[PDB]
Design a protein that fits this description.
Two copies of one chain form a homodimer. By secondary structure, chain A is α+β, with helices and mostly antiparallel strands. Chain A contains four helices and three strands. The first copy, chain A, has one domain (about 1-80): BolA-like (GMP Synthetase, Chain A, domain 3, 2-Layer Sandwich), CATH 3.30.300. A three-stranded mixed beta sheet of chain A has the order 1-2-3. In chain A, a hairpin with a 3-residue loop joins β1 (about 20-25) and β2 (about 30-35). The interface of A and B includes residues 7 and 21 of A. The complex binds cobalt (II) ion (2 copies). Chain A: InterPro entries: BolA, BolA-like_sf, BolA/IbaG_stress_morph_reg.
């Protein structure tokens, strides 16, 4: 997408990363924030959790999305919050 | 600055036994996915109106614009 929306960010991550839910996606076309839940993050460092997400966004991350800030939770970290 | 966290907090306070499972926003335009057992038997249009009313005076100026997807917990399970 030449002009990225928050609904893009949400669809692309859920498509690329199985069992993920983007519970919040915010931003203006250039700077975004996303809160991502995935049970696959269990036992993974914050850095790894973030990389799985950037990798799931594939070429969108490389070419379309200028900046993307993340909070990554397991479903359990989120419900126990 | 109004956030998707605000939207969720406000809908869940105002609309009883509802749950905002996801939300998007740019500061002015927002979307929320809302689950509530109440929505059973009600049309989409009715369910949207119920949520807008639940939000009360938040629509005046806090929330510039808001689209909705409204499901019963069950319909969401598929
Ligand atoms: Co910049
Ligand atoms: Co507007």
């Amino acid at each position: 997408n030449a002009m990225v929306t928050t609904h893009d960010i949400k669809q692309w991550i859920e498509t690329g990363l199985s069992e993920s839910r983007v519970i919040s996606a915010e931003g203006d076309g250039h700077h975004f924030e996303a809160v991502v839940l995935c049970p696959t993050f269990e036992g993974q460092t914050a850095l790894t959790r973030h990389r799985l997400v950037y990798n799931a966004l594939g070429s969108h991350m490389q070419s379309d999305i200028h900046a993307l800030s993340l909070k990554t939770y397991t479903p359990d970290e989120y419900e126990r919050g």
